[PDB]
Amino acid sequence: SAPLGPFNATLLEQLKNDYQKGEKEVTRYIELQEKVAEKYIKMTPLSVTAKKKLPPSKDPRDYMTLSPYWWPDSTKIDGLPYIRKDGERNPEVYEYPERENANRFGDAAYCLGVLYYITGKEVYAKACANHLRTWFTDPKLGMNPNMTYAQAVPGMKKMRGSGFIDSRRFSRALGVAKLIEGSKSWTPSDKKKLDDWATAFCYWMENSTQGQRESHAANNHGLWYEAIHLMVLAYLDRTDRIREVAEQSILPKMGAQIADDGSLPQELKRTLSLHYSTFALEALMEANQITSQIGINLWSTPASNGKVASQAVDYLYPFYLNPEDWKFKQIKPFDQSRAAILLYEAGTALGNQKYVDTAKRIGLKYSTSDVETIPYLVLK
Amino acid sequence: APLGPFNATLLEQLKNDYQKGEKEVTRYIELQEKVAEKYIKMTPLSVTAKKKLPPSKDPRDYMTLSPYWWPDSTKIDGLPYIRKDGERNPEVYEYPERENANRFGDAAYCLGVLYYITGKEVYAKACANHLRTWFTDPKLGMNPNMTYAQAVPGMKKMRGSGFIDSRRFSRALGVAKLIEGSKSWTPSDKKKLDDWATAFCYWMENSTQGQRESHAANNHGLWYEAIHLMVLAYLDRTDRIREVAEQSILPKMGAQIADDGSLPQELKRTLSLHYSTFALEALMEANQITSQIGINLWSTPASNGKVASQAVDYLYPFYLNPEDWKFKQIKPFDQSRAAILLYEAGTALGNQKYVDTAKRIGLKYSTSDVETIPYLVLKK
Numbered sequence: 001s002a003p004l005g006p007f008n009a010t011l012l013e014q015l016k017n018d019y020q021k022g023e024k025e026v027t028r029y030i031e032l033q034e035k036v037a038e039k040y041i042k043m044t045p046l047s048v049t050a051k052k053k054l055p056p057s058k059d060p061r062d063y064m065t066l067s068p069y070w071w072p073d074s075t076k077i078d079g080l081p082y083i084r085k086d087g088e089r090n091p092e093v094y095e096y097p098e099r100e101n102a103n104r105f106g107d108a109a110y111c112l113g114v115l116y117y118i119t120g121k122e123v124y125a126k127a128c129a130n131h132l133r134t135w136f137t138d139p140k141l142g143m144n145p146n147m148t149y150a151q152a153v154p155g156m157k158k159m160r161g162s163g164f165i166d167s168r169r170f171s172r173a174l175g176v177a178k179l180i181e182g183s184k185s186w187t188p189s190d191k192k193k194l195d196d197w198a199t200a201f202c203y204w205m206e207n208s209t210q211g212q213r214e215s216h217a218a219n220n221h222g223l224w225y226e227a228i229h230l231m232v233l234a235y236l237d238r239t240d241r242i243r244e245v246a247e248q249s250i251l252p253k254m255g256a257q258i259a260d261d262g263s264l265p266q267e268l269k270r271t272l273s274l275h276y277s278t279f280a281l282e283a284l285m286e287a288n289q290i291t292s293q294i295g296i297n298l299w300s301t302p303a304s305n306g307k308v309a310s311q312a313v314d315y316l317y318p319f320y321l322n323p324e325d326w327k328f329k330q331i332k333p334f335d336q337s338r339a340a341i342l343l344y345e346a347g348t349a350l351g352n353q354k355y356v357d358t359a360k361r362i363g364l365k366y367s368t369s370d371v372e373t374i375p376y377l378v379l380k
Numbered sequence: 381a382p383l384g385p386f387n388a389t390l391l392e393q394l395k396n397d398y399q400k401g402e403k404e405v406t407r408y409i410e411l412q413e414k415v416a417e418k419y420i421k422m423t424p425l426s427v428t429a430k431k432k433l434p435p436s437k438d439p440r441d442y443m444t445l446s447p448y449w450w451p452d453s454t455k456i457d458g459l460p461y462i463r464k465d466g467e468r469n470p471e472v473y474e475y476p477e478r479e480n481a482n483r484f485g486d487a488a489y490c491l492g493v494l495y496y497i498t499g500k501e502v503y504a505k506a507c508a509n510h511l512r513t514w515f516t517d518p519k520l521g522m523n524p525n526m527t528y529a530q531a532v533p534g535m536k537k538m539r540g541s542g543f544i545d546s547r548r549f550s551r552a553l554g555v556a557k558l559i560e561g562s563k564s565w566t567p568s569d570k571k572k573l574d575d576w577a578t579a580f581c582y583w584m585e586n587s588t589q590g591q592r593e594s595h596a597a598n599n600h601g602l603w604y605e606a607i608h609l610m611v612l613a614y615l616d617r618t619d620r621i622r623e624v625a626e627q628s629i630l631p632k633m634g635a636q637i638a639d640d641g642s643l644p645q646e647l648k649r650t651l652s653l654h655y656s657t658f659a660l661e662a663l664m665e666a667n668q669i670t671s672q673i674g675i676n677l678w679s680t681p682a683s684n685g686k687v688a689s690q691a692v693d694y695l696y697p698f699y700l701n702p703e704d705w706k707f708k709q710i711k712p713f714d715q716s717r718a719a720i721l722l723y724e725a726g727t728a729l730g731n732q733k734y735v736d737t738a739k740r741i742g743l744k745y746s747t748s749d750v751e752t753i754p755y756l757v758l759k760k
């Protein structure tokens with residue numbers, strides 16, 4: 001039985017079982033994944049401190065990014081204050097190295113940790129640990145356990161919690177560190193430092209003003225907040241809190257966001273309405289990967305107001321078959337392949353064979369190096 | 381006004397009205413002077429400020445990534461890259477000269493124009509500093525070629541498509557004519573830049589990449605000639621400008637415009653309204669130069685009788701209502717581009733509907749966008 005973590009544990013356990021029994025199809029698949037993983041073994045571990053422009057704290061270990069839809073105002077002499085263009089990503093975001101480096105770290109750590117769990121080969125735990133130590137716990141290179149300056153906006157007067165959503169990029173890596181416990185490379189001291197960092201990060205996200213505000217967000221930010229929360233809580237083995245968060249925060253939030261026809265009105269007012277409708281459910285999907293490991297199914301458990309997350313999947317399903325039929329603003333193309341994992345997850349949780357069949361028909365590329373697809377041989 | 385890449389009529393009128401002390405223009409130039417202060421302070425940029433070197437190992441070689449080419453996730457190393465028309469690969473921002481050519485071009489153009497209008501030596505001093513560093517400096521100046529522009533990892537054959545990047549610094553080249561005669565731009569400076577532009581002119585006319593780009597069947601071929609005219613006008617080659625116009629630009633226009641005035645090579649793109657407009661922007665900037673020696677590219681026919689104004693007529697209804705556009709346009713079209721374009725084509729054609737619409741669309745009075753400096757007429 002796989003340790004509690006941010007992944008479909010049923011698929012992960014099955015891949016490990018089949019691999020240990022030498023089943024040929026799974027062994028060929030994992031051998032491919034191991035070739036894909038070679039670049040992560042050699043990759044130099046990344047650090048949030050690898051930036052020149054420092055945050056207002058003057059601390060390179062503070063994570064800082066630009067909120068992506070905020071641009072300089074050319075009618076202002078210094079371009080300040082920035083103005084918002086919903087759905088139009090300002091390429092200035094790439095001047096903050098931790099934006100993409102958190103992605104690269106998260107991919108590397110997730111891939112290596114999962115491969116260690118499946119294959120038991122110490123080389124994957126050793127490399128996973130090198131990435132985790134550098135990003136999280138190292139006294140010079142590790143990030144401070146906060147998100148004070150995530151998605152800052154030049155010229156903005158008020159403090160915001162919106163940047164907290166960036167945390168999903170490294171909180172999955174945090175969760176996967178559970179898979180390398182017991183390896184030779186991940187020492188009792190390593191685990192203790194990471195536990196303390198995760199405890200400090202959990203305190204910040206629950207008690208800071210930005211964390212409190214983000215926990216109250218009425219749209220996909222509130223769902224992603226709790227999906228990240230669960231990752232941290234599961235890493236810390238706080239199973240009672242996971243139930244409380246599922247029952248007292250996620251399900252009420254999910255219930256308040258679903259209209260009578262199943263649409264997500266908060267996401268429908270966005271310029272990328274099909275993207276953000278899907279993004280909201282992806283938060284619930286990743287949350288459910290964790291809650292369901294302790295017996296709570298977020299796809300089929302109704303909220304206090306009678307709304308159930310399956311209703312939102314039902315509304316969006318025809319538009320995953322034909323994204324061109326989408327009638328609300330979507331100023332960029334929608335990546336239909338996102339529906340593969342989503343419909344498989346919701347389909348399996350709901351016993352809806354039509355969703356699962358469509359999930360497989362859309363499918364994922366057998367040889368893709370996208371690390372989030374590693375558990376989904378069933379879709380390849 | 382000296383021969384260069386700008387609406388000479390608008391520039392002369394601004395200088396004349398500034399020198400007369402006309403109130404409305406004087407206020408406007410004063411605002412442009414406050415906008416230009418950041419370029420006085422700005423450290424000059426160099427193509428050599430990169431870590432990943434081009435295959436020549438020469439940091440003075442300009443190198444960028446062709447914007448629509450992406451790693452193939454189904455390949456272990458992502459090679460060869462694959463094309464996704466209209467989807468810019470954020471990897472392009474890892475090549476510093478992509479955005480640095482734009483920032484240099486903006487600084488040199490704004491300072492040169494403000495020197496021409498005001499006669500204030502501080503603007504030529506700063507303009508010269510940017511020009512020397514980018515173009516002629518024996519260590520920081522770029523080599524006069526575009527061999528590695530828009531390279532594509534894994535691609536076997538060389539291409540000339542990256543040449544279109546040159547428009548970002550070739551407008552700065554031509555604006556150097558505005559600072560000749562100042563105290564800061566010495567006879568030595570001018571000779572070095574003349575020699576560079578002659579070597580760049582040789583490379584773009586005789587290299588295989590330049591030859592191939594000169595025969596491209598779409599907006600690349602038009603942009604190639606607009607760039608060609610900036611270089612030739614900087615070198616005062618007025619007879620070559622006439623030849624290029626008659627033997628290259630007009631035949632391309634006659635081939636690329638369909639009987640109904642549409643641009644079929646641009647209609648097959650995923651950003652078909654953007655690239656139709658981009659084609660006409662190439663003709664627009666070409667015409668700004670040719671009309672200074674008596675050649676109107678908006679109304680001079682090709683040998684088959686077609687005129688570029690037919691392409692304007694075709695797109696005009698969609699500049700009024702971009703939502704009516706019927707071909708693939710996977711990102712929104714910025715309507716404000718129609719302002720300068722319709723004003724240029726409108727005045728060159730005596731079409732008062734075009735000019736009025738251009739004023740109705742308008743430009744922001746206080747915008748810092750440097751291409752809009754000559755267009756006070758659009759800012760009322």
Ligand SMILES: O=C(O)[C@H]1O[C@@H](O[C@H]2[C@H](O)[C@H](O)[C@H](O[C@H]3[C@H](O)[C@H](O)[C@H](O[C@H]4[C@H](O)[C@H](O)[C@H](O)O[C@@H]4C(=O)O)O[C@@H]3C(=O)O)O[C@@H]2C(=O)O)[C@@H](O)[C@@H](O)[C@@H]1O
Nearest residue numbers: 067068069084086089151162163165166219220221276279
């Ligand atoms: O590129 C990325 O980092 C990822 O972006 C992901 O989408 C996030 C963004 O990162 C931002 O955080 C963005 O924040 C939004 C809020 O969700 C919200 O819409 C907010 O709207 C305000 C608005 O600022 C204004 O004050 C107005 O008057 O009121 C609005 C309101 O109350 O609704 O604006 C924020 C903003 O843009 O700053 O939102 C999304 C999100 O998750 O909703 C995601 O696209 C991911 O795939 C990217 O990788």
Ligand SMILES: O=C(O)[C@H]1O[C@@H](O[C@H]2[C@H](O)[C@H](O)[C@H](O[C@H]3[C@H](O)[C@H](O)[C@H](O[C@H]4[C@H](O)[C@H](O)[C@H](O)O[C@@H]4C(=O)O)O[C@@H]3C(=O)O)O[C@@H]2C(=O)O)[C@@H](O)[C@@H](O)[C@@H]1O
Nearest residue numbers: 446447448449463465468530541542544598599600655658
């Ligand atoms: O750099 C920017 O962001 C600016 O880009 C401007 O658009 C340019 C691009 O930079 C590229 O150079 C792009 O090149 C295109 C060609 O125009 C052409 O479509 C070519 O088509 C081939 C294709 O490569 C492929 O082999 C296919 O099977 O056959 C095609 C064919 O010829 O039929 O593909 C090139 C490519 O994508 O590499 O094109 C544009 C352009 O000017 O057309 C511009 O968008 C600007 O606003 C940006 O700032």
